[PDB]
Design a protein around this ligand. Structure first.
Ligand SMILES: Nc1ncnc2c1ncn2[C@@H]1O[C@H](COP(=O)(O)OP(=O)(O)O)[C@@H](O)[C@H]1O
Ligand SMILES: Nc1ncnc2c1ncn2[C@@H]1O[C@H](COP(=O)(O)OP(=O)(O)O)[C@@H](O)[C@H]1O
Ligand code: SF4
Ligand SMILES: [Mg+2]
Ligand SMILES: [Mg+2]
Lengths: 289, 289
């Protein structure tokens, strides 16, 4: 039953709100789930807990002396729908790797009955604009079974997406690290979905869902909760549920193959995002061109 | 004469365009400068060179076998105004630290007559949203004399700015790492400058300059050059020159002192960016509230 799924993507796109709401929808349809948080903040777990900031492990690393002294309650709590939030908080900002802190955090959960439960899914909210060895270390482990990239039809959300997929390449042979799909969290740029679908199959995956930009998200988040439990009757709530439907029923999980930057550049030149740069004007001043 | 200055900031704000244009203005007023690039791309050096992508060191690390075999020409070139561009390119995406690659790149320049020249300034274009030990490693060295944070009146450009400053704290005692100023690269949100000035003195520095969002930047960058050499007669060109004026004449260089997230949250609640969240509605459903 238990599948270990990572929610990768550039910082800012929609990871935390998407994942918390997906899981809420998933939990509404009877699935037992755990949410793991890796952002250098407590925001990734928040909406389920209704807490301003959940207590991170890195934060309780010094506030216990030794990490070994902590329990399951003080580090992880289940809020709405019995879905278990836990935050890492890597790093202590300026010295050390973010991801090496993340890794020792799951290793805590690895030597306790956290994973070993009647659980179906575990979700790893984590960034990857730049996917360095540090931020690519649950893929070193086999914590990264199913990888889903939240992105949008914009240069760097997408550049990031291709680079998260460059990291599946490296560890693809040595373990079950797969790319499940692509989530397009809407910017509202016209034929955005289309662009993420072009890029989806350019990479070999599909764009499993297109999440809209509904303002109800904002109304639910000032009550520090998910849209799922704020108004289940909301249109976006069923959009979020729809995602969870495709997640559980997902059978397409491929090892991707990245594209060159020229291939990403021409893709955005096709869809009209990037400019039709004249090579005749490059390197020249305004009084001539 | 030689001051070693870093241009820190969140990914996307304006680092590459700001720095290349600052240096171009600086070089127009007779200063000999070197531009160092650390973004996982060649974009940070581009506009001076007019090249689509400059040849990075990490890229020529395998395309030479041993890093020791490379020269000053194949790794660094001077484009317009004799200002010397060099790109690192860290990392090989998925394994290893970005910043540890950056460090060994400057160490190349450290054992060649790159620094030791008739140079006045060196500029380190580098990110810091999350400032980890890896991305905080020219501050471990004394490559980070003068740190200038490009940001805007928005949650994470600013969150980042405070966190770059949290990293000056750590290495402040053990070397000359200072915070020179704050550059506000305009979003156009109304009283944005004001917000970066509030945050500037909340941190102890000043907001040395307010860079506008002029579309001429776009017209100069399709000719893959700086606005300085595209149209010197442009209004934004003098804005960029103005920055360089304050840079050289800068005397204010402090060790900052970060603020709590509540202090950043209330600052944005004062300036109207963040919401006036009702505590009476938190944790409750729509049919009641
Ligand atoms: N589908 C959406 N519709 C509307 N707003 C959204 C949506 N997804 C995310 N957001 C907005 O983006 C903000 C930040 O999202 P988050 O997921 O926390 O970012 P990040 O990628 O860092 O984890 C949300 O709190 C909200 O302001
Ligand atoms: N002063 C400016 N006026 C207008 N656009 C700007 C300005 N500075 C930066 N930009 C825009 O921001 C884009 C990205 O800037 P860049 O400096 O490359 O970002 P980053 O902080 O990652 O290094 C620029 O190519 C341009 O689209
Ligand atoms: S760049 Fe990556 S590997 Fe290097 S310190 Fe940062 S999180 Fe760790
Ligand atoms: Mg987040
Ligand atoms: Mg850049």
């Amino acid at each position: 039953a238990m599948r270990q799924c990572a929610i990768y993507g550039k910082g800012g796109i929609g990871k935390s709100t998407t994942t918390q709401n997906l899981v809420a929808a998933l939990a509404e349809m009877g699935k037992k789930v755990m949410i793991v948080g890796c952002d250098p903040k407590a925001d990734s777990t928040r909406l389920i807990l209704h807490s301003k900031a959940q207590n991170t492990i890195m934060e309780m690393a010094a506030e216990a002396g030794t990490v070994e002294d902590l329990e399951l309650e003080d580090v992880l709590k289940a809020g709405y729908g019995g879905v278990k939030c836990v935050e890492s908080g890597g790093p202590e900002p300026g010295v050390g790797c973010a991801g090496r802190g993340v890794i020792t955090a799951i290793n805590f959960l690895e030597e306790e009955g956290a994973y070993e439960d009647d659980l179906d899914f575990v979700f790893y909210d984590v960034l990857g604009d730049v996917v360095c060895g540090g931020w690519a270390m649950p893929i070193r482990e086999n914590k990264a079974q199913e990888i889903y990239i939240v992105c949008s039809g914009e240069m760097m959300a997408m550049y990031a997406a291709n680079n998260i997929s460059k990291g599946i390449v490296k560890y693809a042979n040595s373990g079950s690290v797969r790319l499940g799909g692509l989530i397009c969290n809407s910017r509202n740029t016209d034929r955005e979905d289309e662009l993420i679908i072009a890029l989806a199959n350019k990479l070999g995956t599909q764009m499993i869902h297109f999440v809209p930009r509904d303002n109800v998200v904002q109304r639910a988040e000032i009550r520090r909760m998910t849209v799922i439990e704020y108004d289940p009757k909301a249109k976006q709530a069923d959009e979020y549920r729809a995602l969870a439907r495709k997640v559980v029923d997902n059978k397409l999980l491929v090892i991707p193959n990245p594209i060159t930057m020229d291939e990403l550049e021409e893709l955005l030149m096709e869809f009209g995002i990037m400019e039709v740069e004249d090579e005749s004007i490059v390197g020249k001043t305004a009084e001539e061109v």
